[PDB]
Amino acid sequence: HRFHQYQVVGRALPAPGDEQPKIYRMKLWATNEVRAKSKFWYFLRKLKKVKKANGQMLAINEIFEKNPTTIKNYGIWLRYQSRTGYHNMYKEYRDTTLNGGVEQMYTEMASRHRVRAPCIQIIKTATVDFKLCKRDNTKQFHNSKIKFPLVYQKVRPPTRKLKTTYKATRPNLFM
RNA sequence: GGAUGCGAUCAUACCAGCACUAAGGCAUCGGAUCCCGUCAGAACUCCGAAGUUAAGCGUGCUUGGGCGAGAGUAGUACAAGGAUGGGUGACCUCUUGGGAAGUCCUCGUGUUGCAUUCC
Ligand SMILES: [Mg+2]
Ligand SMILES: [Mg+2]
Ligand SMILES: [Mg+2]
Numbered sequence: 001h002r003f004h005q006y007q008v009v010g011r012a013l014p015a016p017g018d019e020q021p022k023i024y025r026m027k028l029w030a031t032n033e034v035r036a037k038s039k040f041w042y043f044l045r046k047l048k049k050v051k052k053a054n055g056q057m058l059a060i061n062e063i064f065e066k067n068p069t070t071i072k073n074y075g076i077w078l079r080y081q082s083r084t085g086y087h088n089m090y091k092e093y094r095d096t097t098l099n100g101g102v103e104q105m106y107t108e109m110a111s112r113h114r115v116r117a118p119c120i121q122i123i124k125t126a127t128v129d130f131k132l133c134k135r136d137n138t139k140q141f142h143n144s145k146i147k148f149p150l151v152y153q154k155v156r157p158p159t160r161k162l163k164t165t166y167k168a169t170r171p172n173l174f175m
Numbered sequence: 176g177g178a179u180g181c182g183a184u185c186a187u188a189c190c191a192g193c194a195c196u197a198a199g200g201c202a203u204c205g206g207a208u209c210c211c212g213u214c215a216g217a218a219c220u221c222c223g224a225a226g227u228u229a230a231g232c233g234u235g236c237u238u239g240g241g242c243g244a245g246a247g248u249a250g251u252a253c254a255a256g257g258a259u260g261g262g263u264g265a266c267c268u269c270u271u272g273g274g275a276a277g278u279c280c281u282c283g284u285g286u287u288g289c290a291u292u293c294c
Contacts, residue, residue, distance in 0.1 A: 047250095049249070116261080118269040
């Protein structure tokens, strides 16, 4: 998986003023742990008033998909920066893991809106029952009798050893 | 709980308006020979001790002004380093660091040395 979910826990440095400071937790999506802790300290500085130099890092744990063999419907609420302004949007995805949905979200924002990873803030992630899905192209795959042909086959050899520059006849492909 | 003399800090001590104070000390106060002094014994100077706490000085009060400390403003504004970062540009993102100031709100309104002295 490209993206991992982590639970990061930290607090302000214990000082004689408090000596038992409040504990803060976040669920962040990053490619490894070092990038997860940096993004945590980014949000703690901007949302609370605790930055890394005044704070303590307590724990960091990776969250995993409970059932990576079923298909879930995944809603994502995000904040992104465009060329002119800030906007929030809701996106829906179908995947066996929420990791795949987050990778799907980042890829889609890059294509449809030319938005890079730094300019995106995941507000909220959740699993949505198929009865409550909102976006089209997610409901149409809720058909229990779903049937269709494969309209693009990608004719190719299997293991690159069987590749030849020339062939004696044109390929026959059908669907 | 007070004062006086000489101070330290130099508004938490200043300013404005009100109220009150035992003893003592300060002070107001009486006078113009002498020293001194002016248009003027008002001031300054000299000599006193009839009266008074009215003023001054001291203490307290005010949803007071100011001053001082907090909280908040706000991880905002700004700004050190990095990017073959975005954008036509103006500018703006992210990354490794630093980080303010009015309004608004809360609280406070001194501390203290040496000598002598009053309860
Ligand atoms: Mg006279
Ligand atoms: Mg009086
Ligand atoms: Mg005041």
